[PDB]
Amino acid sequence: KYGEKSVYFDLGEIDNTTGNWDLYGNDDPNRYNGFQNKFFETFAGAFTKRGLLLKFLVLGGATTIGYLGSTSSPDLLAIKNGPKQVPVMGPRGRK
Amino acid sequence: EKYQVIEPLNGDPFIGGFETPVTSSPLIAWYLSNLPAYRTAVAPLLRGVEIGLAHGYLLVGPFVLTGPLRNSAVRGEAGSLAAAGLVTILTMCLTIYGIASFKEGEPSKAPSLTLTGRQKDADKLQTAEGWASFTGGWFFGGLSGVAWAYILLYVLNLPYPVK
Amino acid sequence: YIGSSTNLIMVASTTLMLFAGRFGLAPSANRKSTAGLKLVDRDSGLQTGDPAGFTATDTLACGALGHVIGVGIVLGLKATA
Amino acid sequence: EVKIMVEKDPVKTSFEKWAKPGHFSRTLAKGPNTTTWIWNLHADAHDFDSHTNDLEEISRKVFSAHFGQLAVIFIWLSGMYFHGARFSNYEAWLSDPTHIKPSAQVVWPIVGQKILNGDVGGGFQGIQITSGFFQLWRASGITSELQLYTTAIGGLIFAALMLFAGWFHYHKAAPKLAWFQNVESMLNHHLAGLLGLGSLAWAGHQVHVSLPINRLLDAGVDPKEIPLPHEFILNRDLLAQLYPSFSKGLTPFFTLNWSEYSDFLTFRGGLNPVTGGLWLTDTAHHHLAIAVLFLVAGHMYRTNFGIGHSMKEILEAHKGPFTGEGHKGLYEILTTSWHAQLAINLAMLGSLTIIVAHHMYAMPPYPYLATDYATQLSLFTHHMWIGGFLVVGAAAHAAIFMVRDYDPTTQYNNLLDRVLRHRDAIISHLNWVCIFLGFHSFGLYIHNDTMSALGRPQDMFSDTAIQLQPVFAQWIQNTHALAPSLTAPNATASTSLTWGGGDLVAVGGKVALLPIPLGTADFLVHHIHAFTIHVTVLILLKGVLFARSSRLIPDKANLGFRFPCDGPGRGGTCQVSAWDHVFLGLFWMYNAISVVIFHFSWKMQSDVWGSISDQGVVTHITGGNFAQSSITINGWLRDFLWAQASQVIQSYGSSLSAYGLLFLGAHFVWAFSLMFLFSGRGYWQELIESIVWAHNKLKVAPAIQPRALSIVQGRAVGVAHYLLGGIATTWAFFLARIISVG
Amino acid sequence: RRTVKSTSDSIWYGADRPKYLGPFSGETPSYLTGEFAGDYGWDTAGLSSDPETFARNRELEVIHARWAMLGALGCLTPELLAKSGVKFGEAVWFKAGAQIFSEGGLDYLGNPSLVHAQSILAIWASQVVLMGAVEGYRVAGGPLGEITDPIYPGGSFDPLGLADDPDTFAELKVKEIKNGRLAMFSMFGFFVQAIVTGKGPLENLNDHLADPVANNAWAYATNFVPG
Amino acid sequence: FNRDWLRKDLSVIGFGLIGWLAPSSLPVINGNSLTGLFLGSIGPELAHFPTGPALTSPFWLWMVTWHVGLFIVLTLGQIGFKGRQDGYW
Ligand SMILES: CCCCCCCCCCCCCCCC(=O)OC[C@H](COP(=O)(O)OC[C@@H](O)CO)OC(=O)CCCCCCCCCCCCCCC
Ligand SMILES: CC(/C=C/C=C(C)/C=C/[C@@]12O[C@]1(C)C[C@@H](O)CC2(C)C)=C\C=C\C=C(C)\C=C\C=C(C)\C=C\[C@@]12O[C@]1(C)C[C@@H](O)CC2(C)C
Ligand SMILES: CC1=C(/C=C/C(C)=C/C=C/C(C)=C/C=C/C=C(C)/C=C/C=C(C)/C=C/C2=C(C)CCCC2(C)C)C(C)(C)CCC1
């Protein structure tokens, strides 16, 4: 898009020609407070690495799921509570 | 009778799309430009922190009000744990997506041209390191938001219409 | 019945509609209304003895509209008053 | 401008073309070489616009064919009236409406058919009918077979007249093209005459004939002792005895003392307590008011006399800043193409038929119709199916118009072009709506099933568990029930008894109507209906919008309206034509209408229909299990299909055995359609090659070469046999069950 | 989303001003071409055709406006405070001017330890003299600044520096003139309400809020008929 | 895209309010009186929102009618301006 006339094809401006624009992209550098950034970059910056994040996520999820499953109280889960009534006999007297 | 509102996208009739009151509008455009996702000059970590905080905070309610333990004495804890687990699963999804999409050498993929033809620095979010930082920030912020919502709802009373 | 209120209302409605028809106070066959309600002139191949252009079609149309308005007014007044 | 224009003797009357089977087509006229010719001949017969290119011949053919269909309808009506005059128990039913089952078909004794002649009552043996003709005849005031025989003879005479008119206007005096394009005059004449004058004539018949006869019948006078209809016209003393305001003549009408006629022109809601139908005086005031309104409306459009509106100017005036040229260019489309008019009319007629079904169950207009449960169910289901078929045909013929008669030169920046320019957004948003509705409704049903199976009924979406009440529908019901007090003060009762307010009407120990409660299950089922309807609309609209081109096939309009594919390239382009989109919309319409009729049947049997005894205690047919058992798919399967099919599968050896036979036959035909639906043409062509070798070995190969059915023909045969099987299954099931328990 | 770069285009000063009759304003006075705050083109009396007269009227309007704004806030606050609970010598505005004639004197918020003034002539003479002196400082310069504009001197009178940006300056000027005109209208209302009903604004509002059809200005329609 | 796509008049609001309040207020105990009364008759509003009105209340019908009329008047007024100056008649 040269834009001077009804011309919309221009090899000089190929990003305009192909319509490769940023619709809402905003590049103002000032968003947050300095001390907020200090705190968040100090604490949340540990999880930046991605392979370590994968390993930590998998190990933590496995540990949490196993601990909750194996230590859940009977008053919460019915499967751990177990049966409380007398069993019912089968049709032909088969138990 | 010649006045018309609908216009081709950026004045080019041959690019797929229209430029409508929904798409372009000073209020809508300002609101979408001031969201953390489109703040291209801000470090991805802080944007991820804000996004994670908002999402983790909103997630707490649906899991607590509706759920297997919603009528028990541990409804809040169960809902908060479920929301934290969902945040963890979404963090894993973000990590694997970033691994599959970006390599350590690619400059960036985000468009570097504004609508008015101006040339600007491409967003660092669409990079391996940028996505990794955004994912870490999102994880931390989501956990913080879940914890904050749980504290407000149950650690302190704070009566609410539905709670 | 001739002096009754209903007779007066009906005759007044019909007479006023015919008056607004013959003189250019309402649309007719030879006087078309535009989107702005302007009453431009229209030429129809209908010959009439009335020098103002009022035809038998206009007479029937104005009489019908007058009877309609009169009946509506009479029934509304009877229901309210 | 508007005048009669005809041509004398355009087409000569001869039998020469009757011996040329494919005369209408230039390619079919050469005769057959393969068996495809026969199917092409019977498929292109009534597709007039594909034969010629001039609108005049097409218009003349359409006019004559519509005359022919009118003649066929007249033959059908005459047949119904005659078969009711000679092979019915209509008089015995007239004596005792609440115990005699209507019957108008009698079978011959040949191969054991005797068992179908059931004991309907009145010393009569025959097939019980559910068309509701007895109720209509009683409402018309007919009390003898002589009147029905006279009506049958008149119907035959009218059929002959329509046949002669069709022959006349095609072969002798054919109107010109300028005659058919007088849309203003056509609307004026039809809207005023056909509607207003017809309604006025029916109001006259009601006032002068039906009111006294039905008044005497409701009083208790024996049908044989009631005076004949002309005795109320020749002797106004009787009609003044029944309705005293007739003694004043027509003086109150012309003096505008219309309140004098308030004893036979009433405005009262509800139903007649004796018959369980609408009061006929209300029907009189309403066919009269409709006549007046239509007669006033029919004097609107401009014609030879100057006054009136012009449709072209009206269409060209309404346009705004969001839509460019607006409604410009539509007048030429609608006065140039028959297919656009057909699409609009089919859509409106189908929607109107569905509205008829709803309004007819909710406000039963005929005497002793509400307490005849079989007739109610049959009429509702029938007209609902008809409406569904018509609304699918609307999309079909709209797509035909888009492919054939669309012209981009005339449509530059009007509504049609701008709709065709933002179609991707429309289809995307509609796809999202379909997915959202499907999930948040059918997933609710599946969630209920899983909770019920797991033994956690406290986690279900039921009335006793988590509730989903239809607050908007409940508010509308309450508002409509309180109308006769605030917003329609001149009404006596509400429009229908189905609104929350009201009481119970019982005729002969059976409930006619009753307030219909709405709960969680009703919420679920209407949102199911919304899902299916938006999905059908998605399919048909995608077919119409992408009929000319897409990104996949830029030149789809060159391939035509009805083509199989464009080859296995581009990954595969099967069913890219608008015809196949109609082919899938038919299946989804079937799904939607089946769910609708199942909802109606179960809800009525469970909450409205039933038997009432002394002290006013009501027992329903299924005992109010809809609220609890319809929230699960297993609930439907067990308590509707399994429970209510006991009658059709146990009908052998009784007068209802034909229903079981057709139940089995319909399951069979539906299964049979799957072999056309699931297979392809090449397999059958090769098998036919082997069979042709077998016939060739004995010198008995046919001259016309056998060929496998075309791809489009295979799809059409599959969908036709599928629809026939499914609909006939539901037909037999409903009729057996409701005749047994109704 | 685009960069608008619209620097200065205020809808309150050009030729497309809203004007006081809206669509019916039609022909407007030639001299009232805009260029000044609150220019709605309403000079049907023709009392500002001379530019000197127009400037004098502008200055007098602004000062009457500021006085009316201060008077409005002062007349309204004590009644609302009394509604809150603080006790005052007289709640209404049109009777509190005679509290110093009461031997208990005048008290701020009803506290005897505050002001408690009993002397009259001395305080009136003091306020008259000092306010005449400050009027002179307004007119012909003074210690707090040199007269720059007759209407908008500024200088030390904008310590918060909101009159820096010219666009926001013009917006603030039109906001001031509009709120001031509203205040003058409310002063005329308060004066007339004191004259006709003899009741304070708070109970006038209470009465209008209590059966508005019965309690309005029409209830005092026949109270001044001669004879 | 024009920034002021909805060509800003902002005086149509007052005209619409006046032209909807004049007809609605006319009939006896009908029109905006009901909406104003129910706005006043909130309930135990001494602190916050008293529980919403039940289904069996006239408030719903009155509010629906009032706001529907107001929106119709506002839309027709906006079309009346901006359509008279662009032509269209
Ligand atoms: C009762 C409702 C109406 C029913 C149909 C009536 C048809 C009337 C004639 C129509 C054609 C008019 C033009 C004639 C001219 C025409 O059609 O073509 C003209 C053509 C001329 O053939 P020729 O060999 O006589 O002449 C050839 C020339 O080249 C030289 O003479 O054939 C005839 O004349 C035959 C006419 C009767 C053809 C139909 C005969 C059978 C009709 C009845 C069938 C059912 C009988 C049932 C009995 C119980
Ligand atoms: C003109 C008027 C209101 C006009 C409002 C307009 C134009 C609003 C216009 C706008 O909406 C637009 C178009 C567009 C919007 O974007 C902007 C605005 C600006 C909002 C009210 C008059 C209102 C006039 C009133 C109420 C007059 C009442 C008089 C009374 C009661 C007199 C009583 C007595 O005189 C007696 C009888 C005798 C003795 O007893 C003494 C007393 C007591 C003094
Ligand atoms: C010749 C002459 C003249 C005239 C005269 C006259 C006297 C006229 C009149 C005329 C008229 C006076 C007419 C009228 C008409 C009327 C009409 C035409 C009506 C109609 C009606 C209707 C249509 C109605 C209907 C209805 C309705 C709507 C309601 C209901 C009922 C009914 C249905 C019935 C002139 C002056 C010129 C001159 C001298 C001589």
Determine the distance separating the centroid of ligand 3 and the alpha carbon of C45, expressed in angstroms: 22
- Burial code (b: 16+ CB inside 10 Å, e: under 16) for D484-508 equals beeeeeebebbbbbbbbbbeebbbe
Q: Is D690 in the pocket of ligand 1 (CB under 6 A)?
A: no
Residues D522 and D542: their CA atoms lie apart, in Å, by: 30
Q: Identify the CATH number of the domain in which residue B43 sits.
A: 1.20.1240.10
Residues F73 and F75: their CA atoms lie apart, in Å, by: 6
Which of helix, strand or coil describes residue D105? Answer: strand
At D227, phi and psi to the nearest 5? -65, 155
C79 is in an annotated binding site: no
E1 is in an annotated binding site: no
Q: Do E18 and F11 touch (CB under 8 A)?
A: yes
Q: Whose CA is nearest to atom 10 of ligand 3?
A: C59
Q: Is D322 in the pocket of ligand 1 (CB under 6 A)?
A: no
Q: Where exactly are the structural domains of chain D?
A: 1-742
Task: Tell whether C52 lies on the interface with D, counting CB pairs under 8 A.
Answer: no
Q: Whose CA is nearest to atom 33 of ligand 2?
A: E221
The tally of CA atoms less than 13 A away on the side-chain side of residue D349 is: 14
Task: Tell whether B3 lies on the interface with D, counting CB pairs under 8 A.
Answer: yes
**Exposed / middle / buried, residue E129 (Cβ in 10 Å: 0-12, 13-18, 19+):** exposed
Ligand nearest to the CA of D250: 3
Ligand nearest to the CA of C60: 3
Do the beta carbons of residue D728 and residue D669 sit within 8 Å? yes
Task: Tell whether F29 lies on the interface with D, counting CB pairs under 8 A.
Answer: no
In-domain check, residue B79: yes
Name which of A1, A47, A58 is nearest B139 (Cβ-Cβ).
A47
Token pair of B72, please? 């028990």
Residues with CB under 6 A from ligand 3: C 14, 59-60, 63-64, 67-68, 71; D 292
Q: Is the CA virtual torsion D326, D331, D332, D333 positive or negative?
A: positive
Determine the residue of D11, D13, D15 to mutate for testing ligand 1's pocket, defined as the one with the most ligand atoms within 8 A of the Cβ atom.
D15
CA distances from D15 to C2, D12, D135 (A): 70, 10, 45
Name which of A21, A32, A64 is nearest B115 (Cβ-Cβ).
A21
Which DSSP symbol is given to D357?
H
Determine the distance separating the centroid of ligand 2 and the alpha carbon of F62, expressed in angstroms: 28
Token pair of D524, please? 């679920």
Q: Which atom of ligand 1 is nearest to the CA of D14?
A: 17
Among B1, F80, C34, residue whose Cα is nearest residue D320: B1
Q: Is D15 in the pocket of ligand 1 (CB under 6 A)?
A: yes
Number of compact structural domains in chain B: 1
Angle between helices E166-196 and E201-209 (to 10 degrees): 80
Q: Is D14 in the pocket of ligand 1 (CB under 6 A)?
A: yes
Among D355, E6, D319, D302, residue whose Cα is nearest residue F86: D319
Token pair of F82, please? 């901006």
Cβ-based neighbours of B78, under 8 Å, separated by 6 or more? B63, B64, B67, B68, B69, B72
Q: Do E22 and F3 touch (CB under 8 A)?
A: no
Residues D315 and D416: their CA atoms lie apart, in Å, by: 13
Task: Tell whether E155 lies on the interface with F, counting CB pairs under 8 A.
Answer: no
Q: Which atom of ligand 3 is nearest to the CA of C60?
A: 18
Chains E and C touch (3+ CB pairs under 8 A): no
Which of helix, strand or coil describes residue D34? Answer: strand
Do the beta carbons of residue D269 and residue D484 sit within 8 Å? yes
What's the reported resolution, in angstroms, to a tenth? 2.7
Query: What's the one-letter identity of residue E12?
Result: W
User: Which method was it determined by?
Assistant: cryo-EM
Residues D651 and D667: their CA atoms lie apart, in Å, by: 16
In-domain check, residue B58: yes
Quickly list H helices, A23-93.
Answer: 34-43, 50-71, 78-81
Structural domain boundaries, residue A42: 1-95
Q: Where exactly are the structural domains of chain C?
A: 1-81
Number of compact structural domains in chain A: 1
Q: Position of tokens 């016939």?
A: D695
**What angle (nearest 5°) sits at the alpha carbon of residue D326, between those of residues D323 and D329?**
140
CA distances from F11 to B4, D124, F81 (A): 22, 79, 10
Distance of CA A50 to the CA centre of its chain: 13
Please count the residues of chain E: 227
Number of compact structural domains in chain E: 1
> With contacts defined as CB-CB under 8 Å, which chain E residues touch B118?
3
Q: Identify the CATH number of the domain in which residue E36 sits.
A: 1.10.3460.10
CA distances from D667 to D587, D639, D672, D728 (A): 16, 20, 9, 8
Residues E163 and B85: their CA atoms lie apart, in Å, by: 55
Residues placed in the known binding site of B for chlorophyll a? 31, 37, 50, 55
> With contacts defined as CB-CB under 8 Å, which chain D residues touch B4?
321-322, 324
Among F82, F58, F73, residue whose Cα is nearest residue F17: F73
Residues D509 and D526: their CA atoms lie apart, in Å, by: 32
> With contacts defined as CB-CB under 8 Å, which chain E residues touch A23?
1
Structural domain boundaries, residue B79: 7-155
Which DSSP symbol is given to A74?
T
Structural domain boundaries, residue E93: 23-221
